């Protein structure tokens, strides 16, 4: 019915522009040109509608002059490597703050959010991350990875399954509100789970004494003090491949502290001395950018 | 007034047991013995109250027999280095899970909580952590340290000031729900602030790539894989005091990775080579317990 | 993306005005002049777009005529000694009623308020007085003084710290909803605290007898009865400095009852006879304006 | 019906104790003595109810043994110049804090209140102060005066009319939540009206400058600093009656500042010099208790 | 299951009293007499349970001494021409106020009601008048008539159908909350419908002028001024049957104003002069009781 | 600030029309005529703005062409014997249905109402009938009479006092939601009180038997059956004044049943025979319009 009114304002043009070539200077060709020109509150002057009786029909083009302008308006506006964030929460916000330098889409239920999700360098997709149809509104298929944090682990567990139901291989990262659901959250298909509260809690209990243990975690993740925790990959042909951690003395050599090495989906912290670097191996280390750069070279080719 | 009714039920014993040695076999000594015995619906038989007239006074001991039984009941049940946790939240819960091996008191508004705060090795103090009077119900004065996490940073900021208002030196550790209040949370007097959401968010944005950076934080704080992040202090007389990090090769020597050194209230991550250990200095390092033990000795005296 | 649509409505002018100098009287200079003139539903007549084929391109300028007018509208509006009142409550309202003769800004969360905060001689700044960013929207830095009354002492305590966090010297005046928080309210940084309820309550208990005690407080603060409570300062060179209250007989002399003298941040009520006026001293007294004027002179130079 | 069940448990004693002198050793006198003794789970032993057939009737005394014990219990506890406070609010609370040394009854809708209204030296009457029937539950008729503060001026206006509807002369004191209703609050019958917010507001606006004006009001009503605002009456035969305020130099003489004199229902603040004290006159003055005592004597007889 | 536990506490008496005639002085007759006497915390002394081994079985009678006392308690209190009112509202209340002199049952959802429905001379049946099962709890089948007023016409319409579903002939009287449902309320089966609001409204509009029209309705229905609106039936053999209203001059004769005559389910107001009384006819008239009595006789036989 | 933007759109006319007499054909008189003509998307053609450089300033009149049209719009619409109904309820609605043939104003809090209060022949005044300022928005002063029905008797009691506070003589008609407040409702100043529920209730209890008594009230107030309840006044010079009800036989004479006579503010139902009509007396009677007309004449002069 909304597109059925654009037929009445289209008929007024064949009824309003019709009396132009009939009640004035004949021109069945430039008849609509008079109507559109007149209705568009233009009034250039290609026909002042002089006829008196044609002034009565010219008055009709004034009445139905808004029944096509205020009409074709809502009808003209009723046609014409990215990351998706399901759910909009502080976690999400703080996250969107880092991903600022890239294409991010926040899919959320509450519209009121929009305005702010925009104040932060992200695009807003109004929908419910639980409905696959809306997940698609954010194009999860092509999402480099999806971050999920809804109000209740239940809704999150849902959203995940939904995502799976589309691209069953996108990297999904979810926040767990309660420790007791971390596993279900994985079963559902989350690849990585983060439990802000378990971290927070432990850090608390661990800062009753001295708060360095908690000072570490928070400071390291903050873009301050130069020192930066970085994960460096070992190229296929590495002058290390086969070498022992103990033998490479990466610290003495690079200055980059290695807090652990990773074999996709798994990571070891104080890697034992007799550890042997491989190809896909990833180095989790903290260090001055220089040190880092130096570390990359000490491995290159 | 609740303890003023225990004087009426105590006077009924001097009025009920009084007629025993007066309206029966004289015995001002074993008079109360008859009243208590009778009121206790015992009726052993040391005096069947035979007197007819004394049966009228024996009936009074039956009427006021519940005005001392149903009384001394709620009156008998109305008499017979610790950590205080203000607010009961997941963070709090997860925290109370570590502090299990010690005296912990959770002060919260909602009673329904109690039952669970008990299922977890902690004692419950029903009150509002914003009211100083209730803070005192949990004895903050003697609290080794107070952990604070209320529903809204506002209420937390409050609670803190409150605590300050009592022991202006207790170590206060608070969680911040929003990044924008971390500072006010300190001004108010929080010594240590933890923002689960800032951590969570960043870890997220940092795990779009590879999730080791986030795998580290969560795994390190979990009592698994042997490896343990520990903060070891440098005794006053240390065979290191004055020595350079570069010179002590603590890693090669101990095997304990040092992720940073701390000077009370502050911590440096990749301490520069030319750093010189001092007395109060604290070593933040991850390593096998053995390694740790070994690290402590490599410093002792 | 909201500023990326202003490039499409900017391209329609290079595509709509482009066909003007091509499908009509050549004029690559006054081509945009035809498009803008036409799109602005003006139709002066500098070119009636006569060409039939140019009438087809002239119709395109009518269709995309709103895709630049309804566009450049939200884009043109998307670029282009005062007192601040945080929180909007009856207290606040009644207060804004006195400050009518001056620059006042009310900063509040609920928009619905606006309309009324305007009916009262004040400017409205929509924001949350707890967020420093919004405090700044009201320019607390330059605020002569800030009045604070939010729904819960907690939120107030918050707001205060926030203010402190900016101009750590602005005079802050806060209302306390509960007696038990008057101190925390100060610790946080409130300079002056008013507890309407403590006043109200006491006045009540004090008016069970005769209601003069309560009739005084309310009447004195009301702009009626001539009598006015005034605080008069003692100039540096005063013919009183050093004189005893008993000796100056200010009442007999001036007629201005002195209910107390104040030494910045502190005030004494029935100042003892042997009190000696000083320089900065402030006289809190009630009296007929004349009496007052008379009091000022009895001290001048 | 609650007192009609005490006739069934009284008939069981005439039916339970009746079979004792009929189905055992005859004794229509000591028959109830066996029933009461038995029902009271006493079992002294004055009759072991040996009869086998009488053991069937002795069993009936065991069944209806609780139909008289659990009965006469709630029946024994259901029998064995004051001020009424309608509504329970901070104002009210702070007020009840002064009236501690006297008989006060708080009548309120929410039961949850009770416990606290008791922690404060007052008695609680659960009811709605708007329903006359409940007002009567608090005996307004005999109330020395009624204090009224309900959640909304409307409810208060109501409550008042209600009170009027009973003792149309009790001194009613009400708090007004909004300035715009102070008059209706009076029309309804309130004798004294207190608007905590109008006071609070004004004090605020008045403390932007220096806060003495607000320091006065709050401090004077506080039982401190010794100084106490008192209203002293002029006895019938006074060595002042007829004397001029100017002539009595009460301040110089007593030390008690007189902030105003009152002629029932009315009070003048800086009484003009040519004022003449009368009989019923009341002196509103602030001063050290000694000063006060001294003031009373300077008038006695 | 609640009555299945009274079989376990009944088996403990055949198991507890069984060891009495087995582990003591033989008496299979007075065995239960020992168990009941012992379990009733009586201890008269007809058997002190002396046997040591029988003291082990006498201890079992002490353990299961509460598993029959605390049991038979809630089991002893769990056994020991009327009008039904569905829904409890002011209308209902005001109605129950008239029906005070008779058997009335109020069936309602909210339990909190009970206490009051009892303060008014009625019995309370806790249930939902929409559920037939609960309608039956109030025995509508035998209800002289059912009055229905639930919160929403919808629920009422429901309740009615429900009632119909049982006694499809009980006189149902329902209140309609909205004028627009009076008919549906009848279709559903209400026999009589009352719309307090339509009455109220009209009376209002009719009392803008003079309020007699509204003074009539309210006063007539109030048990005051002697005058009473009464409906008197015309006996089968009446000295009026066939007589004209004009001819009977009932007013002049009786003094009872006849405001209308009724033919079951219908009533005419100013019956025309030429009206002829019949048998079942009912006379709606107002008049002094005497007048009424006089009217009854002027028709008798 | 809303009227401060009309100075910027007024300055654009002195800045936009200014370049017309400077960058075109000089005419400081008809300069604003070009601006207003241009901004009004008129484009008559009195100046096509030919100048190229003036086309750059002519473009500025296109940009700021909406900053005066979309402005002066909300600024042009932001300047340019009756009955008042306080509160909008079914009662009210049903009432407004009768008063259809007259000037009625409904003053209510909820805006959503408006639309409907209009569908019914009444004018809507959005405000709170409790605030005198809004009562005045409906001009109670001149209200022929005010009808009051708010959600709670409390709010009504309020509203009344408010009304009194303005025209202390307007006829006030109020509905009482609860029987227990009918008196307070009067004390407050209601002149006439209607209790739909008391009526409804009684009618119910009275229709358990036969429902004529309730059929009467509802039918009489309904504009059906010809019969109409009317109140006819006795003119000053009446051929009845002094005559006995018994003597005037108004029924026999007129046919109009007299259900009662009224002496302002009071009404008697079956007026005793020996009653004597007076001047101001009002006759409450039901009867055919003819009968009525006939009744008026039987009294005229
Ligand atoms: Ca979250
Ligand atoms: Ca939390
Ligand atoms: Ca407030
Ligand atoms: Ca209050
Ligand atoms: Ca109803
Ligand atoms: Ca109503």
Q: What tokens appear for C250 in the block?
A: 């200010």
- The closest of E66, E57, E3 to E31, measured between CA atoms, is E57
Residue E36's SS3 state is helix
- Which of 43-82 (D) contact E at CB < 8 A? 43-45, 47-50, 52, 55, 58-59, 62-67, 70
Sequence-separated (6 or more) residues with CB below 8 Å from residue F122: F85, F96, F99, F104, F105, F106
Long-range contacts of F34-38 (CB under 8 A, 24+ apart): F35/F61, F38/C42, F38/C44, F38/F62, F38/F65
Q: Is C177 annotated as a binding residue?
A: yes
- How many residues make up chain F in this entry? 301
Q: Is B241 annotated as a binding residue?
A: no
- Nearest ligand to the CA of A204 is 2
CA dist., res. C213 & res. C205, Å (int): 10
The CA-atom distances, in angstroms, between C45 and each of C23, C35, C41, C42 are: 17, 12, 11, 9
Neighbours, chain E (3 or more CB pairs < 8 A): B, D, F
Total Cβ atoms within 10 A of residue D188: 28
- The closest of F15, F95, F237, C198 to D222, measured between CA atoms, is C198
DSSP string for F97-148: TTGGGS-EEEEES-GGGHHHHHHTT-EEEES-TTSHHHHHHT-STTEEEEEE
Q: What tokens appear for D32 in the block?
A: 């109830």
DSSP bridge pairs for D284: D231, D260
Q: What tokens appear for C170 in the block?
A: 């602005």
The CA-atom distances, in angstroms, between D228 and each of A186, C228, C296, F78 are: 71, 21, 28, 56
CB contact under 8 Å between F58 and C33, yes or no, is yes
Q: What tokens appear for E120 in the block?
A: 């008014």
Q: How many CB pairs under 8 A join D and E?
A: 59
DSSP string for A94-145: HHHTTGGGS-EEEEES-GGGHHHHHHTT-EEEES-TTSHHHHHHT-STTEEE
Instruction: Please tell me what DSSP assigns to residue C99.
Output: G
Give distance in angstroms: CA of A248 to centre of ligand 5. 88
Dihedral angle over CA of C222, C223, C224, C226, nearest 10: 120
Instruction: Please tell me what DSSP assigns to residue E222.
Output: S
- The closest of E251, E208, E282, E152 to F214, measured between CA atoms, is E282
Cβ burial of C237 (10 Å; 0-12, 13-18, 19+) is exposed
DSSP bridge pairs for A285: A230, A258
DSSP string for D59-87: THHHHTTSTTTTTHHHHHTTT--EEEEES
CB contact under 8 Å between A43 and C43, yes or no, is yes
**Which fold is adopted by the domain C81-195?**
Rossmann fold (3.40.50)
Instruction: Please tell me what DSSP assigns to residue A276.
Output: B
Return residue ranges of chain C for CATH 3.40.50.720.
Answer: 81-195
CA dist., res. F166 & res. D110, Å (int): 36
Residue B248's SS3 state is helix
**Beta carbons of B212 and B193 less than 8 angstroms apart:** no
Sequence-separated (6 or more) residues with CB below 8 Å from residue A118: A124, C2
Sequence-separated (6 or more) residues with CB below 8 Å from residue C161: B157, B184, B187, B188, C188, C189
Q: What tokens appear for A85 in the block?
A: 């964030």
Where residue C182 falls (left for φ over 0; alpha for ψ -120 to 50; beta otherwise) is alpha
Q: What tokens appear for D299 in the block?
A: 């008038």
**Beta carbons of C136 and C159 less than 8 angstroms apart:** no
Estimate to the nearest angstrom the gap between the alpha carbon of D10 and the chain centroid: 38
Task: Give which of E13, E31, E40 to mutate to test D binding, by max D Cβ within 10 Å.
Answer: E40
- CATH of segment(s) C196-223: 1.20.5.870
Q: Which of D50, D59, D67 shows the shortest C-beta gap to E36?
A: D59
Q: Residue A57: CA atoms inside 13 Å, Cβ hemisphere, count?
A: 21
Return residue ranges of chain D for CATH 1.20.5.870.
Answer: 196-223
Torsion sign across C-alpha atoms E253, E257, E259, E265: negative
First to last CA, chain C: 70
Q: Is B149 annotated as a binding residue?
A: yes
Q: Residues of A with CB below 8 A from F44's CB?
A: 43
- Nearest ligand to the CA of F199 is 5
Report the b/e string of B279-292 with b at 16+ CB within 10 A.
eebbbbbbbbeebb
Architecture in CATH of F1-80 = Orthogonal Bundle (1.10)
Closest Cα in chain C, distance from residue D133 (Å):
24
**Beta carbons of F54 and F114 less than 8 angstroms apart:** no
Unique residue bearing structure tokens 């709509």? C16
Q: How many CB pairs under 8 A join B and C?
A: 49
CA dist., res. D150 & res. D87, Å (int): 5
**Beta carbons of C284 and C261 less than 8 angstroms apart:** yes
Q: Under CATH, to which class is F224-301 assigned? A: alpha beta
CA dist., res. B8 & res. D211, Å (int): 53
Q: Residue F183: CA atoms inside 13 Å, Cβ hemisphere, count?
A: 12
CA dist., res. C186 & res. C209, Å (int): 34
Unique residue bearing structure tokens 């698994």? B224
- Nearest ligand to the CA of E88 is 5
Task: Give which of C87, C130, C148, C186 to mutate to test B binding, by max B Cβ within 10 Å.
Answer: C130
- Which of 24-43 (B) contact E at CB < 8 A? 41-43
Return residue ranges of chain F for CATH 3.30.70.1450.
Answer: 224-301
User: What is the side-by-side order of every strand in the sheet holding D123-126?
Assistant: D123-126, D104-108, D82-86, D143-148, D171-175, D192-194
CA angle D92, D93, D94 (to 5 degrees): 95
- Which of 175-204 (B) contact C at CB < 8 A? 180-181, 183-184, 187-188
**Beta carbons of B263 and B257 less than 8 angstroms apart:** no
CA dist., res. F9 & res. B102, Å (int): 72
Closest Cα in chain A, distance from residue C35 (Å):
12
Cβ burial of B23 (10 Å; 0-12, 13-18, 19+) is middle
The CA-atom distances, in angstroms, between B285 and each of A212, A285, B256 are: 10, 13, 6
- A246 and C CB contact within 8 Å: no
Instruction: Please tell me what DSSP assigns to residue F276.
Output: B
CA angle C26, C27, C30 (to 5 degrees): 150
User: What is the side-by-side order of every strand in the sheet holding B257-262?
Assistant: B228-233, B282-287, B257-262, B267-268
CA dist., res. F271 & res. E287, Å (int): 9
Torsion sign across C-alpha atoms E186, E190, E195, E199: positive
CA dist., res. E82 & res. E144, Å (int): 5
Give distance in angstroms: CA of F148 to centre of ligand 6. 9
Kindly calculate the radius of gyration of chain D based on its CA atoms and give it in whole angstroms: 31
CA angle A82, A87, A89 (to 5 degrees): 110
**Beta carbons of D100 and D121 less than 8 angstroms apart:** yes
CA angle A284, A285, A290 (to 5 degrees): 135
Do F and B touch, counting CB pairs below 8 Å (3 needed)?
no
Return residue ranges of chain D for CATH 1.10.287.70.
Answer: 1-80
- Nearest ligand to the CA of A196 is 1
Backbone angles phi, psi at F294, to 5 degrees: -60, -35
Sequence-separated (6 or more) residues with CB below 8 Å from residue E35: E13, E16, E17, E20, E61
Long-range contacts of C124-132 (CB under 8 A, 24+ apart): C129/C86, C129/C87, C129/C155, C129/C159, C129/C162, C130/B154, C130/C155, C130/C158, C130/C159, C130/C162, C131/B180, C131/C162, C132/B180, C132/C162, C132/C165, C132/C166
Alpha helices in chain A, H assignment, sequence order: 13-16, 32-39, 54-58, 60-63, 72-76, 90-96, 114-119, 132-137, 153-164, 182-187, 196-206, 212-220, 245-248, 250-254, 289-297
**Beta carbons of D125 and D107 less than 8 angstroms apart:** yes
Report the b/e string of B127-157 with b at 16+ CB within 10 A.
bbbbbbebbebbebeebebbbbbbebbbbbb
């Amino acid at each position: 019915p909304a597109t059925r009114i654009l037929l009445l304002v289209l008929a007024v043009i064949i009824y309003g522009t019709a009396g132009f070539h009939f009640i004035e200077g004949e021109s069945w060709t430039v008849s609509l040109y008079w109507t559109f020109v007149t209705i568009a509150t233009v009034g250039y002057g290609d026909y002042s509608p002089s006829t008196p009786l044609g002034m009565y029909f010219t008055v009709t083009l004034i009445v139905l002059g808004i029944g096509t302008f205020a009409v074709a308006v809502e009808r003209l506006l009723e046609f014409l490597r990215h990351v998706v964030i399901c759910g909009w929460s502080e976690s999400t916000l703080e996250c969107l703050r880092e991903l600022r330098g890239s294409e991010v889409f926040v899919l959320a239920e509450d519209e009121n959010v929009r305005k702010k999700v925009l104040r932060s360098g992200a695009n807003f997709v109004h929908g419910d991350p639980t409905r696959v149809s809306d997940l698609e509104k954010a194009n999860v298929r092509g999402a480099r990875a999806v971050i999920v944090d809804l109000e209740s682990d239940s809704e999150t567990i849902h959203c995940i399954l939904g995502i799976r139901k589309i691209d069953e291989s996108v990297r999904i990262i979810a926040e767990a509100e309660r420790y007791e659901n971390i596993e279900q959250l994985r079963m559902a298909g989350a690849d990585q789970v983060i439990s802000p509260f378990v971290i927070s809690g432990r850090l608390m209990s661990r800062s009753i004494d001295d708060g360095y243990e908690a000072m570490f975690v928070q400071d390291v993740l903050a873009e301050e003090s130069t020192r930066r925790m970085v994960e460096v990959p070992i190229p296929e042909g590495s002058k290390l491949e086969g070498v022992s951690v103990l033998d490479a003395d990466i610290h003495d050599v690079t200055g980059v502290i290695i807090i652990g090495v990773g074999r996709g989906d798994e990571l070891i912290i104080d890697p034992p001395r007799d550890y042997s670097f491989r190809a896909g191996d990833i180095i989790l280390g903290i260090g001055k950018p220089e040190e880092i750069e130096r570390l990359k070279n000490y491995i290159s080719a």
